[PDB]
Design an enzyme around this catalytic site. Structure first.
Site, PDB file in Angstrom:
ATOM      1  CE  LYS A 143       7.198   2.506  -2.040  1.00 16.80           C
ATOM      2  NZ  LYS A 143       6.138   1.646  -1.439  1.00 16.80           N
ATOM      3  CB  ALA A 175      -0.249   2.961  -7.259  1.00 19.17           C
ATOM      4  CB  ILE A 213      -0.889   0.045   1.262  1.00 17.46           C
ATOM      5  CG1 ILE A 213      -0.035   0.121   2.527  1.00 17.46           C
ATOM      6  CG2 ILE A 213      -1.802  -1.182   1.341  1.00 17.46           C
ATOM      7  CD1 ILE A 213      -0.873   0.043   3.819  1.00 17.46           C
ATOM      8  CE1 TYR A 242       7.908   5.860  -6.543  1.00 15.66           C
ATOM      9  CE2 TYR A 242       9.653   6.162  -4.942  1.00 15.66           C
ATOM     10  CZ  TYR A 242       8.520   5.510  -5.357  1.00 15.66           C
ATOM     11  OH  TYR A 242       7.996   4.506  -4.578  1.00 15.66           O
TER      12      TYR A 242
HETATM   13  N1  LIG Z   1       3.443  -0.569  -9.672  1.00 16.65           N
HETATM   14  C1  LIG Z   1       4.817  -0.276  -9.589  1.00 16.65           C
HETATM   15  O1  LIG Z   1       5.425   0.072 -10.564  1.00 16.65           O
HETATM   16  C2  LIG Z   1       5.531  -0.425  -8.271  1.00 16.65           C
HETATM   17  C3  LIG Z   1       6.905  -0.631  -8.259  1.00 16.65           C
HETATM   18  C4  LIG Z   1       7.562  -0.791  -7.014  1.00 16.65           C
HETATM   19  C5  LIG Z   1       6.795  -0.736  -5.845  1.00 16.65           C
HETATM   20  N2  LIG Z   1       5.480  -0.534  -5.890  1.00 16.65           N
HETATM   21  C6  LIG Z   1       4.740  -0.521  -4.620  1.00 16.65           C
HETATM   22  O2  LIG Z   1       3.887  -1.669  -4.479  1.00 16.65           O
HETATM   23  C7  LIG Z   1       2.831  -1.298  -3.620  1.00 16.65           C
HETATM   24  C8  LIG Z   1       1.503  -1.495  -4.286  1.00 16.65           C
HETATM   25  O3  LIG Z   1       1.107  -0.598  -5.328  1.00 16.65           O
HETATM   26  P1  LIG Z   1       0.549  -1.107  -6.711  1.00 16.65           P
HETATM   27  O4  LIG Z   1       1.560  -1.020  -7.800  1.00 16.65           O
HETATM   28  O5  LIG Z   1       0.112  -2.570  -6.532  1.00 16.65           O
HETATM   29  O6  LIG Z   1      -0.642  -0.213  -7.161  1.00 16.65           O
HETATM   30  P2  LIG Z   1      -2.140  -0.355  -6.526  1.00 16.65           P
HETATM   31  O7  LIG Z   1      -2.850   0.910  -6.726  1.00 16.65           O
HETATM   32  O8  LIG Z   1      -2.848  -1.479  -7.111  1.00 16.65           O
HETATM   33  O9  LIG Z   1      -2.023  -0.613  -4.995  1.00 16.65           O
HETATM   34  C9  LIG Z   1      -2.055   0.566  -4.135  1.00 16.65           C
HETATM   35  C10 LIG Z   1      -2.710   0.332  -2.927  1.00 16.65           C
HETATM   36  O10 LIG Z   1      -2.510   1.418  -1.996  1.00 16.65           O
HETATM   37  C11 LIG Z   1      -3.621   1.287  -1.190  1.00 16.65           C
HETATM   38  N3  LIG Z   1      -3.791   2.413  -0.314  1.00 16.65           N
HETATM   39  C12 LIG Z   1      -3.698   3.728  -0.644  1.00 16.65           C
HETATM   40  N4  LIG Z   1      -3.961   4.453   0.467  1.00 16.65           N
HETATM   41  C13 LIG Z   1      -4.233   3.599   1.519  1.00 16.65           C
HETATM   42  C14 LIG Z   1      -4.577   3.746   2.903  1.00 16.65           C
HETATM   43  N5  LIG Z   1      -4.692   5.049   3.473  1.00 16.65           N
HETATM   44  N6  LIG Z   1      -4.790   2.650   3.680  1.00 16.65           N
HETATM   45  C15 LIG Z   1      -4.663   1.408   3.124  1.00 16.65           C
HETATM   46  N7  LIG Z   1      -4.334   1.235   1.810  1.00 16.65           N
HETATM   47  C16 LIG Z   1      -4.120   2.299   1.003  1.00 16.65           C
HETATM   48  C17 LIG Z   1      -4.707   1.182  -2.218  1.00 16.65           C
HETATM   49  O11 LIG Z   1      -5.870   0.739  -1.673  1.00 16.65           O
HETATM   50  C18 LIG Z   1      -4.149   0.221  -3.158  1.00 16.65           C
HETATM   51  O12 LIG Z   1      -4.559  -1.108  -2.838  1.00 16.65           O
HETATM   52  C19 LIG Z   1       3.059   0.112  -3.254  1.00 16.65           C
HETATM   53  O13 LIG Z   1       3.720   0.208  -2.041  1.00 16.65           O
HETATM   54  C20 LIG Z   1       3.882   0.643  -4.308  1.00 16.65           C
HETATM   55  O14 LIG Z   1       4.633   1.654  -3.862  1.00 16.65           O
HETATM   56  C21 LIG Z   1       4.813  -0.383  -7.066  1.00 16.65           C
HETATM   57  C1  LIG Z   2       7.641   4.029 -10.954  1.00 13.97           C
HETATM   58  C2  LIG Z   2       7.381   2.822 -10.109  1.00 13.97           C
HETATM   59  C3  LIG Z   2       6.276   2.895  -9.110  1.00 13.97           C
HETATM   60  C4  LIG Z   2       6.582   2.897  -7.761  1.00 13.97           C
HETATM   61  C5  LIG Z   2       5.577   2.964  -6.811  1.00 13.97           C
HETATM   62  O1  LIG Z   2       5.943   2.970  -5.490  1.00 13.97           O
HETATM   63  C6  LIG Z   2       4.234   3.039  -7.197  1.00 13.97           C
HETATM   64  O2  LIG Z   2       3.228   3.083  -6.241  1.00 13.97           O
HETATM   65  C7  LIG Z   2       2.898   4.358  -5.824  1.00 13.97           C
HETATM   66  C8  LIG Z   2       3.238   5.487  -6.561  1.00 13.97           C
HETATM   67  C9  LIG Z   2       2.878   6.748  -6.103  1.00 13.97           C
HETATM   68  C10 LIG Z   2       2.186   6.893  -4.911  1.00 13.97           C
HETATM   69  C11 LIG Z   2       1.832   5.772  -4.174  1.00 13.97           C
HETATM   70  C12 LIG Z   2       2.189   4.521  -4.641  1.00 13.97           C
HETATM   71  N1  LIG Z   2       1.854   3.388  -3.867  1.00 13.97           N
HETATM   72  O3  LIG Z   2       0.908   2.584  -4.220  1.00 13.97           O
HETATM   73  O4  LIG Z   2       2.529   3.165  -2.790  1.00 13.97           O
HETATM   74  C13 LIG Z   2       3.926   3.022  -8.559  1.00 13.97           C
HETATM   75  C14 LIG Z   2       4.942   2.961  -9.511  1.00 13.97           C
HETATM   76  F1  LIG Z   2       4.637   2.960 -10.803  1.00 13.97           F
END
Ligand SMILES: NC(=O)c1ccc[n+]([C@@H]2O[C@H](COP(=O)([O-])OP(=O)(O)OC[C@H]3O[C@@H](n4cnc5c(N)ncnc54)[C@H](O)[C@@H]3O)[C@@H](O)[C@H]2O)c1
Ligand SMILES: CCc1cc(O)c(Oc2ccccc2[N+](=O)[O-])cc1F
Ligand SMILES: NC(=O)c1ccc[n+]([C@@H]2O[C@H](COP(=O)([O-])OP(=O)(O)OC[C@H]3O[C@@H](n4cnc5c(N)ncnc54)[C@H](O)[C@@H]3O)[C@@H](O)[C@H]2O)c1
Ligand SMILES: NC(=O)c1ccc[n+]([C@@H]2O[C@H](COP(=O)([O-])OP(=O)(O)OC[C@H]3O[C@@H](n4cnc5c(N)ncnc54)[C@H](O)[C@@H]3O)[C@@H](O)[C@H]2O)c1
Ligand SMILES: NC(=O)c1ccc[n+]([C@@H]2O[C@H](COP(=O)([O-])OP(=O)(O)OC[C@H]3O[C@@H](n4cnc5c(N)ncnc54)[C@H](O)[C@@H]3O)[C@@H](O)[C@H]2O)c1
Ligand SMILES: CCc1cc(O)c(Oc2ccccc2[N+](=O)[O-])cc1F
Ligand SMILES: CCc1cc(O)c(Oc2ccccc2[N+](=O)[O-])cc1F
Ligand SMILES: CCc1cc(O)c(Oc2ccccc2[N+](=O)[O-])cc1F
Lengths: 261, 261, 261, 261
Positions: free
Chosen positions: B162, B195, B91, B155
């Site tokens: 992070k 996200a 999250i 970012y």
């Molecule tokens: N998608 C990427 O490129 C990427 C890369 C590296 C790390 N991440 C990380 O992986 C994790 C998941 O993100 P994602 O890519 O699956 O997108 P995602 O949007 O599917 O997941 C984001 C989640 O954040 C949750 N969230 C936001 N505010 C919240 C709150 N106040 N309480 C509880 N939950 C809350 C949302 O409900 C959602 O499930 C994040 O920490 C993100 O930073 C994402």
């Molecule tokens: C560029 C790589 C990347 C990193 C994230 O942590 C990501 O998830 C977030 C980005 C901005 C705000 C919040 C989140 N998040 O779900 O933690 C999405 C991404 F595409």
């Protein structure tokens, strides 16, 4: 398990306490077909037995000091296996004085050379020699130690060698990645093995890790092995160029700063 | 599979493209029993369905901004599960301007606060709240990104958040390790998720990674998921305090230095 | 010396044992013109004296919890200095329980918030507020500690805060670099200061470092100061986004693994 | 300046564009007394002139492939200088094919050997040979490159060698630190030098760094030199075992992810 059908070559299985023994055991458990190397005709008997208790009769001599043996190994293997899915590099060496006492006292050009030649060069060298029969989703594993990242007493010239070893992981990952082959390492914690006998103060290190790692416990060849099997499998297909710590988290702390409690 | 009997709570399953969806799918496949959190009563319907397609009817609201919901979550879960084996923290959040354009333009005290509160603080906070019902060999997973280690365009404030998140992994590993609980993170590569929409230039990053990572390919929620399942299992029992890259090795290179080929 | 003509603002000068005192002394020695901040009207007298023994009468209140004071500081300074060449961030804070005993016991949302707000957020916040009067070759310095990189006992929530602090150095370096401003940090070793009193086991850490660092000695505010002056000067014009250790090399070893010698 | 009275030996001054030329110029400026090495009798004339424009007549042959020359160098120097305060290691080598194209194509045992022998081994070897005449507060400097930390195209075998070089810095810092000698490195950015000619795609790298480093500019031998002089001085007495980046912060970012703007 998650390595069914995979054909994997393991180096460095010297005794039932070798890291390579644990990796072998985990891979077998997960359904890999295994093959082994040994150093010197004298050890052919002991290794043929080890391979037998893993359901394998494929054993091949490979002293990594010798280019001829490296090329022969993969000519031989190719007669039994059409393709290779996994390679475990779990070998190394440094002369006694190069891993004892002061780092400079034990430093010579030859000590430096041998250590890097056997412990670092041999990994990409094996990779290159194996490349023609490597399958596209092949995985190569090597073993490193925290002494590459930070100065550890008595580790000395090996630390230099391991740092080059860890760098070769990154260059190998780039060089073999277009084809699809992955390349990683495990930075294992202290484990009582034959090689460990060359590190005076190993018992001291072992005690310190047990006392100071987050998990308050040392690792085992089963734990290193399970992470081996993982990295070698398709579960780890998003992972390459990675140095993975399997050391109960010891790398990540600054321990032992209690003062004569 | 290698997670039979394990009971695991997953946060952050928002859509079928969420990283947490992939982790869930891998864990289920490996024999875990799952439970899920959702944010806001409006989303209760969508998550109850997701849980159903994983054979689970255990869903619990948890907005991590709210101490009351964090405590309630584990009071509720405890009525269904005597003990908890796994926690997935997947999250985060930062206001639009905090992850757009220049790092300073979008910087405010409140933007800083919210970002760190939701994306970093919530992990150890969940850990603390879950501790009484955590089993001794429990495993906690969080998701990070390379933006913690190096400056990535747009970012911005998340990178700061992070880095604190990754530090909490190390302090949590120490704090919970005597008991036996492990704590790790996966530094995932770019994946098109909801996200991801907050990062303008995500498509550019995605292209760059595909072009420049050692594997010449981007990762998937299946790959991140499989490594999730690994870290959460006893195969990874020698591993804690670890930030594991699942990014096709992108972290380990310096790419894109071809010049208008 | 090598800072002639440079005008530098120093925060965090609390006593004659403060790190900021040492940095000030080195900068003055090298020919900088200095200005100082203080927290709370009560301390105006003590700081006005410190500034006087550095040949300066420029003192300005700045509690970094307060946006109004941050903006006022640079409105005030601008009436005396047309432009600013250097900023020293040498401040921080975390509630007692947040830096004592177990990391989880002392963890609360407010403890997390305050720690990050004062110790991490305040640096880029000061940078942003100072930007209009920053000269193109300006240099910004902050102080960090090894607890950001690895888990140190009792350091706890500060470690998280410092990791975010170190990340802000990288994002700030990118954000301010087109203009030409550099941004760095010094990861200082343990020094007996007022803030050090908040770390129970500081004396233990201090002893351990003295015993185990490569130099077999602890650092001084003179040594940290000299490296301050360097980073702030044009001698360091090729250097930005850098976390420089000034800790007798302690960061780079794994010490104390002698066993009850 | 801040190196008055210091006597410093510099290796690797080949032309007026060598990194070692810049370091020499900075040290001289700061009041050091200098001495130089050269490779091969043919180059004695060119180096004697360089030394003359630094006010020095002390020149000594040292091909680091040769143990005899390493021992002779310090026997010779000892006849002129009672004690040595500084040593600059600014040398290296790898066969053409070892730093061109694919990492594996150019990999041979001999290529590996030579590269590590000249670029890595020679530093602690020089340190050991110099130890008897090293003063207690002596400082040793070597030059590394980001290719040790991350895979850079064409850098290849040098990357491995540099990683071992950087490790030797840490072991040397421990080994020589009780006595008081410090040991550090500068990880310099790309600079158009004679050695740079061996890296095809150097111009591409140079362009990329200029475009993508936080400072939007490449470094100079003056900048690397000034940081040299710093590390070699008592201003840097709290600093050892440190790899200091002088690369306009390039190491700390992930650049070039703009997409055909
Ligand atoms: N998608 C990427 O490129 C990427 C890369 C590296 C790390 N991440 C990380 O992986 C994790 C998941 O993100 P994602 O890519 O699956 O997108 P995602 O949007 O599917 O997941 C984001 C989640 O954040 C949750 N969230 C936001 N505010 C919240 C709150 N106040 N309480 C509880 N939950 C809350 C949302 O409900 C959602 O499930 C994040 O920490 C993100 O930073 C994402
Ligand atoms: C560029 C790589 C990347 C990193 C994230 O942590 C990501 O998830 C977030 C980005 C901005 C705000 C919040 C989140 N998040 O779900 O933690 C999405 C991404 F595409
Ligand atoms: N045991 C530990 O504490 C520890 C910790 C981290 C990493 N490692 C590493 O794991 C690897 C395996 O060592 P180990 O602990 O299993 O001890 P081990 O003695 O059982 O294994 C060492 C192996 O090195 C092999 N070897 C030596 N010279 C060789 C040569 N010229 N050609 C081919 N093989 C040669 C030996 O045959 C032996 O199998 C090594 O790379 C070691 O550095 C060990
Ligand atoms: N002393 C060490 O061992 C050590 C080691 C590494 C890093 N550091 C860091 O160096 C910096 C300076 O600390 P120190 O060792 O000189 O001790 P110190 O007590 O002398 O300095 C601490 C400063 O924090 C300031 N401060 C606290 N709250 C503030 C607020 N709300 N607004 C403005 N200023 C505030 C205090 O006024 C004081 O000047 C800190 O960032 C600290 O984390 C210290
Ligand atoms: N120029 C860059 O972009 C760059 C960047 C980072 C690090 N470095 C490093 O800085 C150092 C200096 O290289 P440079 O850029 O000044 O180019 P350079 O060609 O001017 O210096 C190279 C030196 O290597 C010396 N050398 C080669 N073989 C030798 C031997 N057998 N014995 C003794 N000396 C030998 C040469 O004499 C020459 O002085 C090297 O270690 C290099 O790796 C260079
Ligand atoms: C202290 C931890 C440790 C690390 C090793 O690389 C290790 O293996 C070797 C040690 C010295 C020389 C050669 C090896 N080796 O098998 O590569 C043994 C150990 F105990
Ligand atoms: C153990 C080394 C050490 C690190 C600090 O950041 C430090 O400074 C602080 C410690 C706790 C809370 C706040 C600060 N601080 O002034 O930022 C003091 C120390 F002794
Ligand atoms: C791309 C940056 C760079 C790094 C070097 O180490 C460098 O110096 C060498 C390059 C190849 C072989 C040998 C050397 N060297 O002088 O050590 C030159 C460079 F341009």
């Amino acid at each position: 398990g998650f390595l069914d059908g995979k054909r994997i070559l393991l180096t460095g299985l010297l005794s039932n306490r070798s890291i390579a023994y644990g990796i072998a055991k985990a891979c077998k458990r997960e359904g890999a077909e295994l093959a082994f190397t040994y150093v010197g005709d004298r050890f052919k008997d002991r290794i043929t037995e080890f391979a037998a208790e893993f359901g394998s009769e494929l054993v091949f001599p490979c002293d990594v000091a010798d280019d001829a043996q490296i090329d022969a190994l993969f000519a031989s293997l190719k007669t039994h296996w059409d393709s290779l899915d996994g390679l475990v590099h779990s070998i190394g060496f440094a002369p006694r004085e190069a891993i004892a006492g002061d780092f400079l006292d034990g430093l010579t050009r030859e000590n430096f050379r041998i250590a890097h030649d056997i412990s670092a060069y041999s990994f990409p060298a094996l990779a290159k020699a194996a490349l023609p029969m490597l399958s596209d989703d092949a995985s190569l594993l090597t073993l490193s130690y925290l002494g590459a990242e930070r100065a550890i007493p008595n580790y000395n010239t090996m630390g230099l060698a391991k740092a080059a070893l860890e760098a070769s992981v990154r260059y190998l990952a780039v060089s073999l990645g277009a084809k699809g082959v992955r390349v990683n390492a495990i930075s294992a914690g202290p484990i009582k093995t034959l090689a460990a006998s060359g590190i005076k103060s190993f018992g001291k290190i072992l005690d310190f890790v047990e006392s100071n790692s987050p998990l308050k416990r040392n690792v085992t060849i089963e734990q290193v092995g399970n992470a081996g099997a993982f990295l070698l499998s398709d579960l780890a297909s998003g992972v390459t160029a990675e140095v993975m710590h399997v050391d109960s988290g010891f790398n990540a702390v600054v321990g032992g700063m209690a003062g004569l409690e």
